Amino acid sequence: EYWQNQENRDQLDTVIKGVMDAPTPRRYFFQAFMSLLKLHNKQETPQDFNRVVDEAIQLSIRKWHQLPK
Amino acid sequence: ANWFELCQMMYVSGETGEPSLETTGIIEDIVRQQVIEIGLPWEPASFYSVEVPERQRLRKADERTKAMTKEEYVTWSEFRQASFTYRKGKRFREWAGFGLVTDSKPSDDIIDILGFLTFEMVQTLTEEALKIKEQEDLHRERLTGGGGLFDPPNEGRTPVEPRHIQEAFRRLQQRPKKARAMLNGTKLQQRTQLKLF
Amino acid sequence: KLPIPKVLHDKAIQMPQPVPNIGGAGSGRPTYTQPALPKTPAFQLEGEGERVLNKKKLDELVRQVCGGTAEGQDGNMLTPEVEESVLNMADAFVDNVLHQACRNAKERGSKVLEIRDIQLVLERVYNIRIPGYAKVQPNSNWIKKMSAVQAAKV
């Protein structure tokens, strides 16, 4: 229920953006979830959501490629 | 802007090395600040209502001139003509912000005087920074055999550094004690305007 | 399904860059726990070390201002009592300047501290100018009052 209030999510956006200068898969997941919530409320275009998901996928692949075969 | 002009002026003054971009930038900011900050009416003949008609630098320079080759002499003579405003009136006016601080389009004598003054500032700054760097090196002074294919022949000469320019600027800002003699015996702080060295 | 675009936008293809350690948990903890390319910690393989340079800094400044020292003597240019005074001076200067600058910066609506505030404080309170880091006129009422006074004088 904490994510239904507009003020609460506006607050969480600041924390998510604060932890985004060192991207990691979990942080990118949180960003994508926030993007989905924004899209649900007619505050974002699907194209931005797709771009965010593409960035997350690319980072996940890059991290997969650094492990033992 | 004016990076290569600064390089030529430093070369003429005695800096034969290749100073980095930071030194040129600092010198440029100093010169720009000075330019932005910037008989005779008070002669004895002015005492009356009606006027009537009348009727170590040199030594080092000479030593250097005697100690240069023909190609070095040609390069020195060509670099001696470096200027800030010579046939660059529009660029100099844009760089100096003439319109924002004065009525636009001053006469050309003003521009020539400004160029002369700027050349003098660059010369003085270089001459002082060289001495500071030399003293620092002289105090500081007191494993790969074989050899490769790209290492320099003898090296040993390095340009000045931003700290040397900063020390020279600190030295050039001090005023005579005459401007402070009136505060003797008190605890008043001296506050003044930028000194035009 | 999923819309695999015919071309990826410039953000997805970036050639990663070094990144700092953020989160506030801490670093170097030998416990049970990442970006693509972390930044290398600073290190020095061999040399004098900071513990010596920091102690020699004051002697270097004294040599600079004192004019020059003759051979066979150096370092002992201030007595033990004056060095403590100088260090106290430095600490007090730093603290006072920073305290003034932060409040001045917050006054004008900013949320970050920039060099302009420090420069303003240094220039207007201590008469110090550090190079290389980038008017008033009377209004009509004053003019009217001066005109009245001048008319009265004649």
Helix content of chain B: 40-55%
In helices, the fraction of residues of chain A equals: 55-70%
The major pleated sheet of chain B works out as: none
Distance between the termini of chain A: 42 Å
Structural class of chain A: mainly alpha
Strand content of chain A: under 5%
Number of strands of chain A: 0
The succession of helices and strands of chain B, N to C, reads HHHHHHHH
Quaternary class:
part of a larger assembly
Q: What's the β-strand tally of chain B?
A: 0
Order of helices and strands of chain A: HHH
Radius of gyration of chain A: 14 Å
Distance between the termini of chain B: 22 Å
Q: SS-based structural class of chain B?
A: mainly alpha
Strand content of chain B: under 5%
Number of helices, counting only DSSP H or I runs of 4 residues or more of chain A: 3
Radius of gyration of chain B: 22 Å
Shape of chain A: globular
Largest interface: B-C, 19 and 12 residues
Number of H/I helices of chain B: 8
Task: Give the helices and strands, then pairings.
This is part of a larger assembly, with chains A (69 residues), B (197 residues) and C (154 residues).
Chain A (H helix, E strand, L loop, with lengths): L5 H13 L6 H16 L5 H19 L5
Helix pairs in contact in A: 1-2, 2-3
Chain B lengths: L2 H11 L7 H17 L19 H10 L3 H10 L9 H8 L1 H4 L6 H34 L20 H11 L25
Chain C lengths: L49 H17 L13 H28 L7 H12 L13 H14 L1
Helix pairs in contact in C: 2-3
Could you explain the architecture of this structure?
The structure is cut from a larger assembly and holds chains A (69 residues), B (197 residues) and C (154 residues). With 69 residues, chain A is mainly alpha-helical. Chain A contains three helices and no strands. Chain A has helices at 6-18, 25-40, 46-64. In chain A, helix 2 runs antiparallel to helix 3. The longest helix of chain A is centred in the C-terminal third of the chain and has 19 residues, at 46-64. Chain B has 197 residues and is mainly alpha-helical. Chain B is 53% helix and 0% strand. With 154 residues, chain C is mostly helical. In chain C, helix 2 crosses helix 3 (115-126). The radius of gyration of chain C is 29 Å and the shape is flat. Chain C has four helices and no strands. The interface between B and C is medium-sized, with 19 and 12 residues. Chain B: It is found in: Nucleus. Chain B: Belongs to the SPT3 family. Chain A: Belongs to the PI3/PI4-kinase family. TRA1 subfamily. Chain A: Associates with DNA double-strand breaks. Chain A: This is Non-specific serine/threonine protein kinase.
